[PDB]
Amino acid sequence: QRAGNFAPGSEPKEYLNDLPGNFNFDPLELGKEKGTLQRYREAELIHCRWAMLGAAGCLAVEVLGLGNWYDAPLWAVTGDKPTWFGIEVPFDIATILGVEVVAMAVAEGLRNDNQDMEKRLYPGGAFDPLGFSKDPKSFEDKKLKELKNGRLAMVACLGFAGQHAATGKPILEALGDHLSSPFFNNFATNGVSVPGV
Amino acid sequence: AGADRPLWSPGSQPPAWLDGSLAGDYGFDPLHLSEEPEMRKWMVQAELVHARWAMLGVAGILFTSIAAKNGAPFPDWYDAGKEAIKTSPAPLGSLIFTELLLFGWVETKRLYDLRNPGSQGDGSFLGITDGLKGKENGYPGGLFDPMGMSKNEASFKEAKVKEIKNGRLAMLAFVGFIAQHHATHKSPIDNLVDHVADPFHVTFATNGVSVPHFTEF
Amino acid sequence: FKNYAKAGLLCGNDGLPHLISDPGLALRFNHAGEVFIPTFGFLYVAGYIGHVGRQYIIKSKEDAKPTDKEIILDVPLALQLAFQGWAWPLAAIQELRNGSLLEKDENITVSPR
Amino acid sequence: MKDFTTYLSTAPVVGLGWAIFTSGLLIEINRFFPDPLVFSF
Amino acid sequence: NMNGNWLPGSQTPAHLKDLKMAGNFGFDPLNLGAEPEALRWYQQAELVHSRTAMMAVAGILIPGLFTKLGALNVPQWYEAGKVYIEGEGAIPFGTLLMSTLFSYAFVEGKRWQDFRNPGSQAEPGTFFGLEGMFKGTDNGYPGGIFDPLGYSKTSPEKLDELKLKEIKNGRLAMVAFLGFAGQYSATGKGPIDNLADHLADPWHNTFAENGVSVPGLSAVEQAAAS
Amino acid sequence: NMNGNWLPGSQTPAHLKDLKMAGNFGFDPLNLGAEPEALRWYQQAELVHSRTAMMAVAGILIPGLFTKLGALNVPQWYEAGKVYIEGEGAIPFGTLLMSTLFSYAFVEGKRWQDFRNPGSQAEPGTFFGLEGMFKGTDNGYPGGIFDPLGYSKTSPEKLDELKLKEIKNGRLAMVAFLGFAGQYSATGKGPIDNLADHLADPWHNTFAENGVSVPGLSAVEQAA
Numbered sequence A: 001q002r003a004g005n006f007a008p009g010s011e012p013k014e015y016l017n018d019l020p021g022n023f024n025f026d027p028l029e030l031g032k033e034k035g036t037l038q039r040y041r042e043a044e045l046i047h048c049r050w051a052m053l054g055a056a057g058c059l060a061v062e063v064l065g066l067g068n069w070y071d072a073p074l075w076a077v078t079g080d081k082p083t084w085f086g087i088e089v090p091f092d093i094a095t096i097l098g099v100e101v102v103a104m105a106v107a108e109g110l111r112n113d114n115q116d117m118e119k120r121l122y123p124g125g126a127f128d129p130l131g132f133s134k135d136p137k138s139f140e141d142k143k144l145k146e147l148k149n150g151r152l153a154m155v156a157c158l159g160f161a162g163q164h165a166a167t168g169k170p171i172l173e174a175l176g177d178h179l180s181s182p183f184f185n186n187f188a189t190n191g192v193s194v195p196g197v
Numbered sequence B: 001a002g003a004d005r006p007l008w009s010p011g012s013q014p015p016a017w018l019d020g021s022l023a024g025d026y027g028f029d030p031l032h033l034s035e036e037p038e039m040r041k042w043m044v045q046a047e048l049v050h051a052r053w054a055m056l057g058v059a060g061i062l063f064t065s066i067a068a069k070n071g072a073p074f075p076d077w078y079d080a081g082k083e084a085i086k087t088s089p090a091p092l093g094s095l096i097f098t099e100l101l102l103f104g105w106v107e108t109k110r111l112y113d114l115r116n117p118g119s120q121g122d123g124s125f126l127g128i129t130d131g132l133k134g135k136e137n138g139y140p141g142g143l144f145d146p147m148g149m150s151k152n153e154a155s156f157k158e159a160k161v162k163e164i165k166n167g168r169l170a171m172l173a174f175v176g177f178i179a180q181h182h183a184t185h186k187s188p189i190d191n192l193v194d195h196v197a198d199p200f201h202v203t204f205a206t207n208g209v210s211v212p213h214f215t216e217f
Numbered sequence C: 001f002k003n004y005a006k007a008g009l010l011c012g013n014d015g016l017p018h019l020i021s022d023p024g025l026a027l028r029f030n031h032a033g034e035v036f037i038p039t040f041g042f043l044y045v046a047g048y049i050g051h052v053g054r055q056y057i058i059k060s061k062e063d064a065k066p067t068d069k070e071i072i073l074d075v076p077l078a079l080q081l082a083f084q085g086w087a088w089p090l091a092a093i094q095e096l097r098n099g100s101l102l103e104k105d106e107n108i109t110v111s112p113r
Numbered sequence D: 001m002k003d004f005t006t007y008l009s010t011a012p013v014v015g016l017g018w019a020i021f022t023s024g025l026l027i028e029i030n031r032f033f034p035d036p037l038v039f040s041f
Numbered sequence E: 001n002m003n004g005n006w007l008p009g010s011q012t013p014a015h016l017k018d019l020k021m022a023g024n025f026g027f028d029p030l031n032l033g034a035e036p037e038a039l040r041w042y043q044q045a046e047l048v049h050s051r052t053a054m055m056a057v058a059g060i061l062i063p064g065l066f067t068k069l070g071a072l073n074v075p076q077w078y079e080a081g082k083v084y085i086e087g088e089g090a091i092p093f094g095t096l097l098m099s100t101l102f103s104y105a106f107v108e109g110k111r112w113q114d115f116r117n118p119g120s121q122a123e124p125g126t127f128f129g130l131e132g133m134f135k136g137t138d139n140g141y142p143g144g145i146f147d148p149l150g151y152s153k154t155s156p157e158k159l160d161e162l163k164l165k166e167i168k169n170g171r172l173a174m175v176a177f178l179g180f181a182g183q184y185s186a187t188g189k190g191p192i193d194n195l196a197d198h199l200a201d202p203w204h205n206t207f208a209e210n211g212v213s214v215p216g217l218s219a220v221e222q223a224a225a226s
Numbered sequence F: 001n002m003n004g005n006w007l008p009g010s011q012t013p014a015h016l017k018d019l020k021m022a023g024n025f026g027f028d029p030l031n032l033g034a035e036p037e038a039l040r041w042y043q044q045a046e047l048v049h050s051r052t053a054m055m056a057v058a059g060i061l062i063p064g065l066f067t068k069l070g071a072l073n074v075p076q077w078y079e080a081g082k083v084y085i086e087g088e089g090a091i092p093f094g095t096l097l098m099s100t101l102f103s104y105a106f107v108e109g110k111r112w113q114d115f116r117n118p119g120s121q122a123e124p125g126t127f128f129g130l131e132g133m134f135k136g137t138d139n140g141y142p143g144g145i146f147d148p149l150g151y152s153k154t155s156p157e158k159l160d161e162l163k164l165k166e167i168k169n170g171r172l173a174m175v176a177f178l179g180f181a182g183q184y185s186a187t188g189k190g191p192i193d194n195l196a197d198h199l200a201d202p203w204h205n206t207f208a209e210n211g212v213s214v215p216g217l218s219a220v221e222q223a224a
Ligand SMILES: CC(/C=C/C=C(C)/C=C/[C@@]12O[C@]1(C)C[C@@H](O)CC2(C)C)=C\C=C\C=C(C)\C=C\C=C(C)\C=C\[C@@]12O[C@]1(C)C[C@@H](O)CC2(C)C
Pocket: A026, A027, A028, A030, A047, A050, A051, A053, A054, A055, A056, A057, A058, A068, A069, A070, A072, A073, A157, A158
């Protein structure tokens, strides 16, 4: 029932058995009650997918030699015409904000109208163009792998935010510096993350 | 745990409302407070929170003063707020009101758990039912007791007695901190080193305060 | 002296400031804050006092020896009615609407003619 | 305690408490707002 | 039952315990909703205040957001009337206020008439033939031409969910407009500028930092700084 | 049984009377280890304090003895942090502090999880597969990678003799590091220098001469 277990030998969770991607966890007992646990499941999958999109939007523009991710939305301050993948979209920040608000409002309104809890978790159909998870065991394995990569991308996005709050240097340059100088380039060397070095 | 228990004064009659069930019940009550069960519950909760805050503050003061005497650049426990908001990114006004906003939730949850026991643990706060339920009057438990050595009743009683005794000791320690910092204008660790350096001379009678000197003869 | 000036206060022939009491005239010359706003505030507070006293009079009469409650005040009840009087005009006009604010002339102690 | 509380619940004691409360409120208002006459925000 | 509790561990009022009206949380500490007709009038007044608050907050934020973004050039809400009344084609302030008062007098008189007698505005032949759908389905929910898209013609569970969403966004909007007035009086700037100030510098731009909101805290701040 | 008495003629505590563990001498005037769970916690804490004190006294004495023999140029322990922070390959103090904190937090978390439930780290596949051999045979003595050369599968008498030797040398190391701290706070020199001065002049190398140790004794010393 448990894919894994952090801190092996911990107290077993009688309320987290059939959950996909379950590594026991929750020492704060936040997963009690079925409705709250289901709502937290929806929040966890949605936040993992949004962390996927954020990590994609960071790393794809970082490794393509187009700039960092902090200066990417700064053109609204500058007013210079944006560029995406060399397609050179002429849209304006007022129109962009309006269409984004309308589109995400109607999309999340449609998502909130899922009736069934499992359909709110994984609807399929139009959202599954090929559907490799037709097999139930393959479905469970894909759900576990999606949750694992989502948690890893969540940690990556939090690291992006913290690193770019500490220093303006890009995270791929941070990885290069940690490879070149591990013991002389880390969060303790900045002195801002932890006071008193 | 009652009846023939050590009291605040040997031979004094213990109060009727102080049967010895509470932790640290030495039958000490000259003013006959906490006679009513609700007043007793309020006094127990107030003593527990004052004890916890006193122990936390005295431990922080002692750690900062010990580090300052060792060589770390730490200010004295008195007037530490001045240099604190001189170097704080958060100025005064915003910091104290942010602290009040952060404290209001915990304080009102404590108050309405004291008034209504077990009412907080009903899924109202982020869907928590088993947790956030007060095990005793002033002893909530739950997520505030992550490791469960309070599950045993005798161990829980001994922990309660130890906690209330160390709390009263820290109350007197904080009062002593205030008094001998107003008297000597030095750190409590400085007073300790002065007392263990010349015990026969350095005391509460040679500071020029506490005992007044008028004739000087 | 600086605050009395540049605040709409006016004085006649003696330097002692004068207050305009007629509404409308005080509204079109920015003198409403002299007496118009304070009189409304005092009416609000006086209605608070009256509503709290009425609530304590009514709520301490359906019990044995109401004079004992009158002479020895129920402090938690008094404080509860104190903190529940913030909406005195709403409750007052609602009691007027349902007729419980006023007593009929048949249950009222009356002097002989 | 409850007998002393009912003594404090008597009318002169609660009237005294109201007197100190109202007097202190008005005095602190007058002290921190020195001599106002007209409501001007 | 009840949607939630505004104050956990506190006893709910008796009139609010078994009540099933949407947007209920037991928040009657002053016990004003004890009477049923008074509760109905309070619910209708809350609906009206909330709806006009949502309209006002939208008209403050969305044009304000577009102006701070740069596409729009409409003024901020706290001076828009003054600059508009200075226009060369401006309708006079008295004329606009009188027309607003007359139109709102007609509308609120119709609302009063359908409140004091429910469904009484459907009297035949009283408003150009189109008075048939001018009836009150519920307290504060007339329907008909007020619901031309037919979104309210849904199962009662979804209708109750929509009512809960309406009253919650409404209460948020009244709190938001109270904030608009309050920290316009405090900061003297637009709400979008205040949001940008709080985002850029959260600690230094706080309601306790300025002395307008909390008088005397600034004196304590300079006392501690000295 | 018991390995002896800390004080002959003194009555053994009831919880220390009929127990079975290494290094038992009845030394508990305060009866702190009355609770068996508290006794296990105190035993584990004493074991880890003794082990880190053994490492401390080893790194203080053996490089110090090599320095006194002229083989090495290792400085004293009370300035070695300042020596390393000023070196050419000076890793910053913060980086080393956080690395040590993270590694020791992981180690202490694993040890605490093994202490709360004995043998609970032997669940299959949690830690690279080999964690099935991480089961703690005794509280504080897991074995396995901790003893790869194989001195644990000996006779039980040999096992308790080795445990008693470990406890005795550990307690000696703890009092040795307490002496190192006291001698640095009073004499201000290295422990090897103190030992050399005690060998050269036993009477002059005494803490009675130092006024930091016994205040007022030097007053009597110069009074005569
Ligand atoms: C922090 C966070 C959640 C944290 C949750 C925590 C700690 C949970 C706590 C607990 O588990 C613990 C610890 C232990 C348990 O005892 C208790 C619980 C309670 C179980 C979510 C953030 C979630 C954050 C999210 C989703 C952020 C998404 C951001 C996006 C998409 C941004 C877009 C852009 O990045 C692009 C794409 C390209 C760029 O150029 C431009 C921009 C605009 C910057």
